[PDB]
């Protein structure tokens, strides 16, 4: 079962922190990933969402789409524009999430939650691959 996991990080108020999103147990080449990661917008501002180009290929043909227009939600979509030549076929880091911690943020854990209802993983023909998700968190220190 393919697993999409958000990592963990700690940071002081005002610091910029980086959180990896990993895919594991990959076998069938993956042609499509749709995942939504929710965060506490009162504590964190998304600085950027960058793909790991060692694993996510053809980013120059717009294979990696990010949407951060909705407060507290990051939407990430990977699609192989060729349907054959640039699949995700090995485990590794999919992307890095950079957050800026509000200077007035309270100490403690804040969850990074993956929406299981909208999580999609499929092969190059858009056929579903059995998948699961694992949440992460940010710990303000």
């Amino acid at each position: 079962t393919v697993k999409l996991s958000v990592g963990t990080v700690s940071g002081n108020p005002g610091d910029t922190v980086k959180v990896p999103v990993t895919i594991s147990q990959v076998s069938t080449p993956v042609g499509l990933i749709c995942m939504d990661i929710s965060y506490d917008a009162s504590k964190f501002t998304v600085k950027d969402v960058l793909p790991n180009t060692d694993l996510v290929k053809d980013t120059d043909n717009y294979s990696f789409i990010v949407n951060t227009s909705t407060p507290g939600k990051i939407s990430i979509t990977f699609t192989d524009p060729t349907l054959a030549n640039y699949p995700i076929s090995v485990d590794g880091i999919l992307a890095y999430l950079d957050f800026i911690i509000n200077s007035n943020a309270t100490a403690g854990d804040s969850a990074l939650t993956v929406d299981p209802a909208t999580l999609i993983v499929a092969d190059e023909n858009d056929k579903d691959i059995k998948d699961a998700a694992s949440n992460g968190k940010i710990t303000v220190t």
Binding site: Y62, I65, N67, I120, D126
Partner: protein, 61 residues
């Protein structure tokens, strides 16, 4: 009425120009001349990467 499945720019044909609109919309851009009613390609009630992938499949076919 728009009777072409996947014709997001309403020019009669489904090609790479529609894929660009779909990509820009999913990114959150405001796409000039887009037909928002044609975005739910597979008709499952949501507009997401699966619609983009089915659009790419139709264009390749």
């Amino acid at each position: 009425s728009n009777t072409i499945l996947g014709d997001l720019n309403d020019d009669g044909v489904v090609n790479g120009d529609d894929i660009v609109m779909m990509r820009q919309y999913l990114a959150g851009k405001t796409v000039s001349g887009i037909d928002k009613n044609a975005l739910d390609i597979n008709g499952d009630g949501a507009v997401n990467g699966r619609d983009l992938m089915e659009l790419i499949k139709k264009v390749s076919n």
